[PDB]
Design a protein around this ligand. Structure first.
Ligand SMILES: CN1C(=O)[C@@](c2ccc(OC(F)F)cc2)(c2ccc(F)c(C#CCCCF)c2)N=C1N
Length: 368
């Protein structure tokens, strides 16, 4: 998997993308790695934010499925045309797949100005594919057509323009050099999103003491296509109160805590130690057993030395977005219906951690 290391790039808050080629001859595009959706959806017509796009006309191997797709969603919308073509990942496995491609012809608030990607690689399951679950997701095609093992892993690394970020998507395996210590696994509750179960939450060692159903209300998911840790309303309010209290030696405006206003210190003086660590305890493979992943302010204050608060409110459940994933090497073990976490290879007092087991009772009752 040596050749797949550092195959991801992005700008802070604009997602991580992998280089792909579509069609014959190959057309090079940058594609968002998105565990929170299930379509391979690519810009296929001019757009003000797109500097290149997929040209079906130019591909000898393109096949029209003669059906459209319209996807309205919360933040925006897109419209397109379904078909198939040959798809490769130059810094991925040495294979070529015939995949479904939604060629986006019209969109609103979908593409991001300056992001440097032109499409999305939906890595989640067929249940949430558009227009419906009959449209085989890319990874499913890849596994069915090739000898690639049914697993992928993501090392998303942190670190005037938006700061450039990097990482690795290891397709078909686990690269031991990308993590230290043990890999701890949480069950995939249901194969639609990468749905998981959080059984408790601590801020600086202090239990939020909520009924665990609250942490998963109405679901909890692992989503590389979301920047923030997003939390259900009641959990969000409990969390910010706790973080405000720990960092009380300094005062910040409401705009900061609402994740919309930046906060600055002079270069090098960021008081990391006034901000608490946050531990999410995930359901273990064994009943009554959990493990915790612990994240630092360095993860949840996102650089814009100016930072935005990267924890925000959700009405669609918990979203463990890039800022959770950036602490860790994350294994999407589809074959064994489980997601692994270990401390990623990528300050002086604190470190991100993955630690277990911890005995917490009635974990199945945390669902919903
Ligand atoms: C939450 N989320 C989205 O809204 C979405 C998405 C993807 C496909 C969809 O339709 C499907 F049918 F093609 C609908 C929604 C998404 C859409 C547009 C975007 F610029 C981004 C992004 C980004 C970079 C910041 C976090 F990286 C994510 N991906 C996620 N995880």
């Amino acid at each position: 998997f040596v050749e797949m290391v550092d195959n991801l790039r992005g700008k802070s808050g604009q997602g991580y993308y992998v280089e792909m080629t579509v069609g014959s001859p190959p057309q090079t595009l940058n594609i968002l790695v998105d565990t929170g959706s299930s379509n391979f959806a690519v810009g296929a017509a001019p757009h003000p934010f797109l500097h290149r796009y997929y040209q079906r006309q130019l591909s000898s191997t393109y096949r029209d499925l003669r059906k459209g797709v319209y996807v309205p969603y919360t933040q925006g919308k897109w419209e397109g045309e379904l078909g198939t073509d040959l798809v490769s990942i130059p810094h991925g496995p040495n294979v070529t797949v015939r995949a479904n491609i939604a060629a986006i012809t019209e969109s609103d608030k979908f593409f991001i100005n300056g992001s440097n990607w032109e499409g999305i690689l939906g890595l989640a399951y067929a249940e949430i594919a558009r227009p419906d679950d009959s449209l085989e997701p890319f990874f499913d095609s890849l596994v069915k057509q090739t000898h690639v093992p049914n697993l992928f892993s993501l090392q998303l690394c942190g670190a005037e323009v938006l700061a450039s970020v990097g990482g690795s998507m290891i397709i078909g395996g686990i690269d031991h050099s990308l993590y230290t210590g043990s890999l701890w696994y949480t069950p995939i509750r249901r194969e639609w999103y990468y749905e998981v179960i959080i059984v408790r939450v601590e801020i600086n060692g202090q239990d939020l003491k909520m009924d665990c159903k609250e942490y998963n209300y109405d679901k909890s998911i692992v989503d590389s296509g979301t920047t923030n840790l997003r939390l259900p309303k009641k959990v969000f309010e409990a969390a910010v109160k706790s973080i405000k209290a720990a960092s009380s030696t300094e005062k910040f405006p409401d705009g900061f805590w609402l994740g919309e206003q930046l906060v600055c210190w002079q270069a090098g003086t960021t008081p990391w130690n006034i901000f608490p660590v946050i531990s999410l305890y995930l359901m273990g493979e064994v009943t009554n057993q959990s493990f915790r992943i612990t994240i630092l302010p360095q993860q949840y204050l996102r650089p814009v030395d100016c930072y935005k608060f990267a924890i925000s409110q959700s009405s669609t459940g918990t979203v463990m977005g890039a800022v959770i994933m950036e602490g860790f090497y994350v294994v999407f073990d589809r074959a064994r219906k489980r997601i692994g976490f270990a401390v990623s290879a990528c300050d002086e007092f604190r470190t991100a951690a993955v630690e277990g087991p911890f005995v917490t009772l009635d974990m199945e009752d945390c669902g919903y």
